[PDB]
Amino acid sequence: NAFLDDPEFADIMLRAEQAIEVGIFPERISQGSSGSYFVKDPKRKIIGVFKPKWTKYNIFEMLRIDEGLRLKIYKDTEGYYTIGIGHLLTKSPSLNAAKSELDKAIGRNTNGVITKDEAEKLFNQDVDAAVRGILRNAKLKPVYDSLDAVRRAALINMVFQMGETGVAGFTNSLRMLQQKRWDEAAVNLAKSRWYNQTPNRAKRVITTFRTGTWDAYKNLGRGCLIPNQGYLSEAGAYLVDNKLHLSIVPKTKVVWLVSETFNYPPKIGSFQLFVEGYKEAEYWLRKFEADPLPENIRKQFQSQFERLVILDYIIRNTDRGNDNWLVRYEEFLIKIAAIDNGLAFPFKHPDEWRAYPFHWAWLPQAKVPFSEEIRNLILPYISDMNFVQDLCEDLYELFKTDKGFDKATFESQMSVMRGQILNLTQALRDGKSPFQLVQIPCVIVE
Numbered sequence: 001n002a003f004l005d006d007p008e009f010a011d012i013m014l015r016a017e018q019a020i021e022v023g024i025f026p027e028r029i030s031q032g033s034s035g036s037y038f039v040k041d042p043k044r045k046i047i048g049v050f051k052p053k054w055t056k057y058n059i060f061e062m063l064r065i066d067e068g069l070r071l072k073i074y075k076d077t078e079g080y081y082t083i084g085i086g087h088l089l090t091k092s093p094s095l096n097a098a099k100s101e102l103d104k105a106i107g108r109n110t111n112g113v114i115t116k117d118e119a120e121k122l123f124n125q126d127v128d129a130a131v132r133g134i135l136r137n138a139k140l141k142p143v144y145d146s147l148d149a150v151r152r153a154a155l156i157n158m159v160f161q162m163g164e165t166g167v168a169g170f171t172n173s174l175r176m177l178q179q180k181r182w183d184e185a186a187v188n189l190a191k192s193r194w195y196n197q198t199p200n201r202a203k204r205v206i207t208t209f210r211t212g213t214w215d216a217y218k219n220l221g222r223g224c225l226i227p228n229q230g231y232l233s234e235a236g237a238y239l240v241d242n243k244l245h246l247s248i249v250p251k252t253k254v255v256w257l258v259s260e261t262f263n264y265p266p267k268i269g270s271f272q273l274f275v276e277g278y279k280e281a282e283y284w285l286r287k288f289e290a291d292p293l294p295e296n297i298r299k300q301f302q303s304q305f306e307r308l309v310i311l312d313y314i315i316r317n318t319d320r321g322n323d324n325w326l327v328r329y330e331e332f333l334i335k336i337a338a339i340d341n342g343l344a345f346p347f348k349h350p351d352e353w354r355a356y357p358f359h360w361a362w363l364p365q366a367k368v369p370f371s372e373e374i375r376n377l378i379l380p381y382i383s384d385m386n387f388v389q390d391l392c393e394d395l396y397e398l399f400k401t402d403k404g405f406d407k408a409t410f411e412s413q414m415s416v417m418r419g420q421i422l423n424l425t426q427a428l429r430d431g432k433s434p435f436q437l438v439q440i441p442c443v444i445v446e
């Protein structure tokens with residue numbers, strides 16, 4: 001825990017270590033979670049927040065992903081009774097009717113509950129039925145016979161989801177598939193009620209038709225964040241703040257601490273300075289409805305808000321609510337503290353079924369254009385490519401400390417961050433607002 005460049009932070013860490021020696025241990029902020037502690041000095045005053053650090057692809061795995069697995073009767077998108085892996089029981093609203101149909105299919109009285117093996121058994125039968133529907137159909141079989149195995153699975157997937165008759169209705173798209181006009185068929189298949197009802201699944205199936213690959217099913221659930229590196233994200237947010245002189249992130253560094261209260265020998269983690277007298281932003285936003293800020297303080301609050309927008313956009317924070325940016329209100333008359341920055345610096349921009357929006361973008365303040373004050377203060381930095389390169393190198397030195405560091409994954413993080421900086425640069429030049437800034441389509445700098 002050497003902080004030669006920051007003696008003030010080192011003394012704070014020394015006070016933390018001294019308190020531990022006299023038995024004053026950090027306490028969990030929430031009793032349920034062991035990843036966040038309030039660190040106290042020898043006078044039991046809180047000084048900081050410490051946060052310690054073969055798959056086979058085929059129609060079956062394709063449909064397991066698209067349909068899920070439920071062992072108890074549930075309602076589908078239309079509200080129809082369903083169980084297992086996308087097995088429709090009946091269109092009747094009667095739950096007893098669904099249980100009646102389920103009992104016939106299983107061979108025993110289930111009362112709406114089956115086992116995984118029974119769910120798989122129905123799943124195999126349903127897939128075979130879908131293949132039978134394809135082969136017995138004069139419009140599906142010629143398409144099926146002409147397709148490779150991967151694209152055949154996409155055809156089976158559609159017949160599974162909507163039935164033989166429904167898929168047979170795609171007269172022109174089926175012909176395009178048979179003629180191997182993948183791009184034309186993919187475009188034409190999107191203009192369907194099927195796509196609108198289930199857009200995420202239809203996009204996966206259409207991509208399978210377009211490419212003949214499993215790429216739409218390979219990296220699902222990976223997320224956009226490197227695992228087990230939140231402590232570096234916390235430290236990286238302060239680094240970005242400090243280089244831009246935003247002064248809204250409390251000083252946060254990677255430190256090592258040993259404590260009996262930890263869940264198990266030093267533990268690495270992020271140490272963020274505790275700030276006192278701050279309330280959640282949602283609290284003060286609520287209070288300003290009855291007591292709106294005087295114009296001098298409103299301008300000061302908006303400039304602080306712009307700094308928060310700049311920080312979050314640059315680091316592409318995925319976990320900013322209006323509860324985890326704090327506001328102090330009674331030099332600065334009103335101040336913002338950007339805390340809890342452990343889920344930033346994603347290695348890729350998020351997909352659009354899980355957008356991870358900035359929750360301050362909903363606020364009316366976000367429609368206020370960036371002030372000329374913030375633009376003149378920030379544009380000289382972010383428009384300077386030497387500055388941007390130095391920032392990336394600073395983050396490299398910090399991020400490479402972790403054992404799981406990967407050069408390719410890190411350069412992905414910087415490409416996302418450089419892309420964010422580019423869009424922010426243009427938005428400031430255009431005099432846009434934080435609300436308009438987050439509308440710009442995401443870009444990367446390769």
Ligand SMILES: [N]C1=N[C]=NC2=C1N=[C]N2[C]1O[C]([C]OP(=O)(=O)OP(=O)(=O)[C]P(=O)(=O)O[C]2[C]([O])[C]([O])[C]([O])[C]([O])[C]2[O])[C]([O])[C]1[O]
Nearest residue numbers: 029030032033035036049250272273274275276324339340
């Ligand atoms: N610098 C600072 N100065 C002053 N006050 C600070 C401060 N920093 C923070 N506070 C305060 O301390 C609270 C918690 O600080 P925090 O960062 O939110 O920690 P936290 O562990 O993430 C919480 P959690 O319930 O989400 O814990 C969950 C788990 O339970 C699990 O479910 C998973 O989701 C995750 O492992 C985990 O996020 C904040 O609200 C603030 O009032």
